[PDB]
Enzyme design. Structure first.
Site, short mmCIF file in Angstrom:
data_model
loop_
_atom_site.label_atom_id
_atom_site.label_comp_id
_atom_site.label_asym_id
_atom_site.label_seq_id
_atom_site.Cartn_x
_atom_site.Cartn_y
_atom_site.Cartn_z
N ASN A 185 0.09 0.56 0.93
CA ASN A 185 0.18 -0.23 2.18
C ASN A 185 1.55 -0.92 2.27
O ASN A 185 2.15 -0.89 3.36
CB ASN A 185 -0.91 -1.30 2.29
N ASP A 242 -6.03 -0.13 -3.32
CA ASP A 242 -5.84 -1.48 -2.71
C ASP A 242 -5.75 -1.33 -1.18
O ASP A 242 -5.31 -0.26 -0.72
CB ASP A 242 -4.60 -2.17 -3.27
N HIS A 255 -5.85 -1.17 5.78
CA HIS A 255 -4.49 -1.43 6.33
C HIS A 255 -3.63 -0.15 6.32
O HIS A 255 -2.41 -0.24 6.58
CB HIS A 255 -3.83 -2.60 5.59
N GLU A 275 -10.78 -0.50 -1.84
CA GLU A 275 -10.96 -1.92 -1.43
C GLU A 275 -10.79 -2.00 0.09
O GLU A 275 -9.63 -2.02 0.54
CB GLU A 275 -9.95 -2.83 -2.12
CA LIG Z 1 -0.05 -0.87 6.83
#
Ligand SMILES: [Ca+2]
Ligand SMILES: OC[C@H]1O[C@H](O[C@H]2[C@H](O)[C@@H](O)[C@@H](O[C@H]3[C@H](O)[C@@H](O)[C@@H](O[C@H]4[C@H](O)[C@@H](O)[C@@H](O)O[C@@H]4CO)O[C@@H]3CO)O[C@@H]2CO)[C@H](O)[C@@H](O)[C@@H]1O
Ligand SMILES: [Ca+2]
Length: 558
Positions: free
Chosen positions: A195, A341, A345, A384
């Site tokens: 991310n 993780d 996103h 996650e």
């Molecule tokens: Ca992003």
């Protein structure tokens, strides 16, 4: 408020579960009883809290591993064991000389390797480690106040995915860890981030010659010094203050970093972060343009990073580089899976690509190392997604074998003082997890340390349906450590080895017996649950095909 126990032996009705004249073991005590009139009588051994772990006496060894019955041990490698103290200060990193809230304590892969026997004694069959990949070299301001220097001790501020972090160890150190783990039937999982990359630090700016300062000539040398990273906050300054010296307007200067094609960030001539989960900037971290179909080349600052194993590849997007760099480690070392993780996103296609590649890479390594290979099992990936519960979400259609269950922590909180209060949660879970899998936890670095239980945390976690995540120190009641002005930091306190070999020896021994019992019985993780009806204590059986187990809790002793 909880079922009670006189302390005397229990006579259990096993009629429907175990066969007539067959021998049954309480695995916790070693006590064996023969069934007659569909009944047995057993005293829970002292230090058991009134637990009986009842199995067929045939049971001799651990069962064949399944991810649906997995016992994952989540370790922050820096905060566990310092095997090699020589690497504690890589890239000019320093201890803060105060409470070491956000510094590298010096824990490393070598030290982790020295404790694989300890993990195997708990029936741990999967080890999830913080990203061992090269982090940002320097620090940022820690917490809201800036009361401590925050280094990348946790592996979430990645700088170069193509290299190991010098604090964690060498390619040799990682190979020894994976090979010694595989010999002990322990799978290796990497924490992976796609991310974001780490913040801009003074150490990285100086080393890789990116960004811009307001200070020039000898006023720069007076303030920051020879090595800008060695700077301490002065009078009326906090650890955030160094950002006052950094010119975040300089377009030409900040292009020398990742580059406009690699990240969204509120700096220079970069595309500003978006408004949705995918393109927003988490805590002012550079957001990696994982959705970009634009050929990026390498990060611009890799020009001044000669030690990188990253090479330009034709037609490659930032996503392609990232999935490639992460997959390499699987191909080279035989990494059995990733914990991913910040899954919400990053678009789903990215995660599918990573899975496709990592799956191919593991298949290759297992082909090429058939003596070392545990089994022919595919690459396992868990995610996650914040607030994810017991649910077969869209994640499961785009390369995830299991998502992290956020809901179990608070459900188990309602059973801290009384084990039997979890029954409704375990019935729900044992049923829904016939069709899919999750990874449930009591403690995490993102939430809190589950300590309100004591040693009862062992049965709350290890007897839960589906994959379970022991956070390092759960077994030893590792206390919430100093935290400064960041509330989560205390969750990452040093492993309390003095307690493992001291006051928490009873607790660790408890965890070892439950975890070993779990390793022997896939029914715990995978089986259909029948809650028993007794005036004498709480109990259930779980049956999944071959395996059949009965777990009786007598109750509160006085
Ligand atoms: Ca992003
Ligand atoms: O490195 C890239 C970034 O650099 C610059 O950001 C700095 C900030 O100036 C510092 O303040 C600090 O950020 C802290 C912040 O002080 C703290 O409050 C907290 O941030 C909150 C924020 O207040 C809140 O509105 C929301 O966005 O959540 C945030 C996270 O909890 O925590 C921050 C870091 O722990 O450090 C960074 C990095 O040096 C620059 O201004 C940015 O544009 C750039 O991306
Ligand atoms: Ca070390």
């Amino acid at each position: 408020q909880c079922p009670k126990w006189d302390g005397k032996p229990l006579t259990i009705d096993v009629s429907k579960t175990f066969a007539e004249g067959s021998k049954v073991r309480d695995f916790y005590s070693g006590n064996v009883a023969t069934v007659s009139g569909g009944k047995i009588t057993l005293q829970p051994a002292f230090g058991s809290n009134g637990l009986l772990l009842l199995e067929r006496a045939e049971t001799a060894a651990p069962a064949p591993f399944d991810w649906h019955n997995a016992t994952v041990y989540f370790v922050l490698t820096d905060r566990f064991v310092n095997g090699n103290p020589a690497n504690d200060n890589s890239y000019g990193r320093h201890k803060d000389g105060m409470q070491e809230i956000g510094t590298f304590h010096g824990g490393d892969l070598q030290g982790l390797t020295s404790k694989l026997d300890y993990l195997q004694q708990m029936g741990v069959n999967a080890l999830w480690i913080s990203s061992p990949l090269e982090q940002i070299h320097g620090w940022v301001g820690g917490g809201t106040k800036g009361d401590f220097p925050h280094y990348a001790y946790h592996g979430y501020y990645t700088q170069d995915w193509s290299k190991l972090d010098a604090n964690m160890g060498t390619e040799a150190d990682l190979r020894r860890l994976v090979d010694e783990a595989h010999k002990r039937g322990i799978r290796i999982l990497f924490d992976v981030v796609m991310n974001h990359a780490g913040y801009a630090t003074l150490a990285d700016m100086q080393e890789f010659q990116f960004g811009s300062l307001y200070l020039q000539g000898d006023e720069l040398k007076k303030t920051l010094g020879e090595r800008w990273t060695d700077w301490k906050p002065g009078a009326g300054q906090t650890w955030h203050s160094f950002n006052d010296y950094i010119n975040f307007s300089d377009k030409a200067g900040w292009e020398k970093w990742w580059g406009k094609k690699w990240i969204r960030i509120d700096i220079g001539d970069y595309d500003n972060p978006g408004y949705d989960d995918l393109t927003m900037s988490l805590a002012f971290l550079p957001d990696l343009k994982t959705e970009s179909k634009e050929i990026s080349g390498l990060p611009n600052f890799y020009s001044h990073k000669p030690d990188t194993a990253a090479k330009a590849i034709p037609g490659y997007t930032p996503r392609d580089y990232l999935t490639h760099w992460l997959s390499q480690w699987v191909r080279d070392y035989g990494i059995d899976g990733f914990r991913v993780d910040t899954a919400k996103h990053v678009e789903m296609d990215a995660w599918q690509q990573l899975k496709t590649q990592a799956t191919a890479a593991l298949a290759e390594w297992k082909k090429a190392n058939p003596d070392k290979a545990l089994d022919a099992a595919p690459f396992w990936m868990t995610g996650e997604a914040w607030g994810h519960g017991v649910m077969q979400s869209d994640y499961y259609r785009h390369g995830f074998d299991a998502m992290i269950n956020f809901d179990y922590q608070d459900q188990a909180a309602k059973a801290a003082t009384c084990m039997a209060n979890i029954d409704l949660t375990w019935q729900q879970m044992a049923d829904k997890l016939q069709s899919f899998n999750v990874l449930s936890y009591l403690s995490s670095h993102d939430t809190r340390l589950f300590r309100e239980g004591g040693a009862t945390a062992a049965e709350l976690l290890l007897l839960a349906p589906g994959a379970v995540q022991i956070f390092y120190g759960d077994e030893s009641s590792r206390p919430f450590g100093p935290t400064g002005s960041d509330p989560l930091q205390g969750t990452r306190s040093e492993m309390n080895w003095q307690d493992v070999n001291g006051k928490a020896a009873r607790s660790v021994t408890h965890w070892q017996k439950i975890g070993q019992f779990r390793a022997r019985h896939p029914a715990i993780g995978m089986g259909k649950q029948t809650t028993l009806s007794m005036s004498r204590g709480y109990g259930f059986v779980r049956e999944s095909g071959e395996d059949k187990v009965m777990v009786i809790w007598a109750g509160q002793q006085q």
